[PDB]
Design a binder for these strands. Structure first.
Lengths: 135, 99, 62, 189, 213
RNA sequence: CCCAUGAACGAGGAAUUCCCAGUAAGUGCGGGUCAUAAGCUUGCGUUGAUUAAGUCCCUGCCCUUUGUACACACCGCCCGU
């Protein structure tokens, strides 16, 4: 079922935290990244558009993710936090910090923390006009 | 009447400056005129530093920082209160805020 | 959820649209004394003892 | 012969600790035989906090517009059938007397967030007095409504009021209402 | 309906012998059923592991991409696939009052591996400099880039992948470039910024066995 | 004033007015008007007080800087077949 090898050591996964300003993704996956353990977003925890990116929704999603990973044998997590990136914003959304803190607070062990938002060497045009969005 | 001697931008001895996009509205603003903020912030907020540190596998990990360069149009930089309007005399002060 | 005795060092002020929470800074006495800030409600007088049932609740300021 | 009341005393009730007198404080002139000492608890903040919790408990039944403030009422309430229960018990009611209310108490209340949004509340706390006595005020409403249009009336709840008074364990009702709100708003930590 | 993790086996990922730490973690795959086989499912998945998790006395800002080549005995055997620096490290070395010089070469090793090494170097301010900015002139930058390319080519094309990675572990090439460019313009933070493999020779099982000790 | 003849008989469209301790509210009494004419007002005691020792969100005010094509001063000025 799970790795019951060397109970005294850590089993490491990778948590890809995608914190956009619309909602937040808490995605724990294999060490290589190909196999996924569980992905719980903030939108499957709140029934309203606005709170999809809220810190509370991210805390709930991270709690469920950590519960599933603990019941699946994974004990420690490497963090790969990303914002939307591209030509859009590079600042992580409101739920990133709360998701990370909820992962740490719910009995998970944190490994290396890395920021992986996609940064262009230079990009295509942004979705706004030349005068920007005026609201 | 001329409000600023540099016309609100930092262009001397050249004709054209490549534009950039405001981080808020995506307005096309010249790079010299745009208001630039370099934010070096910890990935883990100060409230969560202790909780992340305890759950760390490695002792003495020193958490990474975030390096984001912010470009602002004049409208968004004024609205966000990064810059404020100043008096006719204090406008000339180019020293960055002591913080 | 330990019970820790901490003394108020300074009272910052109120927050909200109309003002409904109070900010104080409390310092521990027997936990390798360090300065931690926390919002608070009700009469918490000048330099009284605020009881921490938990060492993780912070005050998000401004 | 400095024994408190005509029955209690201040020479055998000791905790050997001088950090836990926030509930019962009988060591000076503030000791009261009968709570009818008059006074104004609204003259200044930190003065209704300076109240003895017995006096706050009995007086804070000063609600409706017709029974508001009348100290004769509270003194008659706490005298009548208390004079009976003292000679009718004989044993110590101390167990329940302390052990339901005075640590039923909650541990956190909440506050408003930002500038708008009435959908959740940021969890805070106070040095125990304000939260315990906010539970006490909601319990004033609760014991009233347990009498208000109800069967067990005023001037006869002396057992439950001594419970609401004395010291340290958990069985209350409006306090578990406050604890439901406690957990709900505490999900924000 | 059907729990998909009840049909999943766990596998051990092994680092090449060039690293002190051998077991770099664990990995999953669905059991061999019908057409799909477990071994094919673990033959191209890449593990980016910090060097401090590979060598116990090294720096943590260097990451190595290790790709599994074959699986035997439920152990996944990996090989060097790429090297990189952490985003925070690279963003930290890019300051505002200095020149950053970048170079890259496509150079093959002696065992058929074709690599693209990326080198980055920054102009250093002297300990008694009063001038705010330290900028190399364009010819100085070109000379520094030429020296970077020459040193990388000299350090890669003569050795095979094993010694190339052994040089990468302490970044010998970066220190060599920093030493060589000291007389053109004193450089500050010289690193082999990134290594990506463009093409590899045909798989040889014996070569991989000699690679894992 | 009395026969007790029984009236949604126990916290209130949109909009809101006043109020922080002897506030509010209940309650009576006295002056003015007057023929002891008060449901009004001006005072006076009596019972007696839940909530708050804060904020600039709404309505406004003030001690600054800034913009203005306004000066009858934003209820301004002003553009369009």
């Amino acid at each position: 079922l799970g790795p019951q090898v060397a109970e005294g050591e850590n089993v490491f996964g990778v948590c890809h935290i995608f914190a956009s300003f619309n909602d937040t993704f808490v995605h724990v996956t294999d060490l290589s990244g190909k196999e996924t353990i569980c992905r719980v977003t903030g939108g499957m925890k709140v029934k309203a558009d606005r709170d999809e990116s809220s810190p509370y929704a991210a805390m709930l999603a991270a709690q469920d993710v950590a519960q599933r990973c603990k019941e699946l044998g994974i004990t420690a997590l490497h963090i790969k936090l990303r914002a939307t990136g591209g030509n859009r914003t590079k600042t992580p959304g409101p739920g990133a910090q709360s998701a990370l803190r909820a992962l740490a607070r719910s009995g998970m062990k944190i490994g290396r923390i890395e920021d992986v938002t996609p940064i262009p060497s230079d990009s295509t045009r942004r979705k706004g006009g030349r005068r920007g969005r005026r609201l | 009447t001329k409000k600023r001697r540099n016309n609100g931008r930092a262009k001397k001895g050249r004709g054209h400056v490549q534009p950039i996009r405001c981080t808020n509205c995506a307005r096309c603003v010249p790079k010299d005129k745009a208001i630039k903020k370099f934010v070096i912030r910890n990935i883990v907020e100060a409230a969560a530093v202790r909780d992340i540190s305890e759950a760390s596998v490695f002792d003495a990990y020193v958490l990474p920082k975030l390096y984001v360069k912010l470009h602002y149009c004049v409208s968004c930089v004024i609205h966000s209160k990064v810059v404020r309007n100043r008096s006719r005399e204090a406008r000339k002060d180019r020293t960055p805020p002591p913080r | 959820q330990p019970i820790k005795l901490a003394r108020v060092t300074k009272v910052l002020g109120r927050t909200g649209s109309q003002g409904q929470c109070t900010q104080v800074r409390v310092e521990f006495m027997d936990d390798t004394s360090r300065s931690i800030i926390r919002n608070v409600k009700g009469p918490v007088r000048e330099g009284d003892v605020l009881t921490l049932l938990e060492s993780e609740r912070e005050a998000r300021r401004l | 012969d400095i024994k408190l009341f005509g029955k209690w005393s201040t020479d055998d009730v000791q905790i050997n600790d001088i950090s836990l007198q926030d509930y019962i404080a009988v060591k000076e002139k503030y000791a009261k035989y009968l709570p009818h000492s008059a006074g104004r608890y609204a003259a200044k903040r930190f003065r209704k906090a300076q109240c003895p919790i017995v006096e706050r408990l009995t007086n804070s039944m000063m609600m409706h517009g017709r029974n508001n403030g009348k100290k004769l009422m509270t003194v008659r309430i706490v005298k009548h059938a208390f004079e009976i229960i003292h000679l009718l018990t004989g044993e110590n009611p101390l167990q329940v007397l302390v052990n339901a209310i005075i640590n039923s108490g909650p541990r956190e209340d909440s506050t408003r967030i930002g500038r708008a949004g009435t959908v959740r509340r940021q969890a805070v706390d106070v040095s125990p007095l304000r939260r315990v006595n906010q539970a006490i005020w909601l319990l004033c409403t609760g014991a009233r409504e347990a009498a208000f249009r109800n069967i067990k009336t005023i001037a006869e709840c002396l057992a439950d009021e001594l419970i609401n008074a004395a010291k340290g364990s958990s069985n209350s009702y409006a306090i578990k209402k406050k604890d439901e709100l406690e957990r709900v708003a505490k999900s924000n930590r | 309906v059907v729990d998909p993790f009840s049909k999943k086996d766990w596998y051990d990922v092994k680092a090449p012998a060039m690293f002190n730490i051998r077991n770099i973690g664990k990995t999953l795959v669905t059991r061999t059923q019908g057409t799909k086989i477990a071994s094919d499912g673990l033959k191209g998945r890449v593990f980016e592991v910090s060097l401090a998790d590979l060598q116990n006395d090294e720096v943590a800002f260097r990451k190595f991409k290790l790709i599994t080549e074959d699986v035997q005995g439920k152990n996944c055997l990996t090989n060097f696939h790429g090297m990189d620096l952490t985003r925070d490290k690279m963003c930290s070395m890019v300051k505002k009052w200095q020149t950053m010089i970048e170079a890259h070469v496509d150079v093959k090793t002696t065992d058929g591996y074709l690599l693209r090494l990326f080198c980055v170097g920054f102009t250093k301010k002297r300990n008694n400099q009063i001038r705010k900015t330290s900028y190399a002139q364009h010819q100085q930058v070109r000379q520094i880039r030429k020296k970077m390319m020459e040193i990388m080519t000299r350090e890669v094309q003569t050795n095979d992948l094993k010694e190339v990675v052994n040089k990468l572990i302490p970044d010998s090439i970066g220190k060599d470039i920093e030493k060589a460019c000291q007389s053109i313009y004193p450089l500050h933070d010289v690193f082999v910024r990134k290594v990506k493999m463009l093409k590899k020779p045909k798989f040889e099982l014996g070569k991989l066995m000699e690679l894992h000790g």
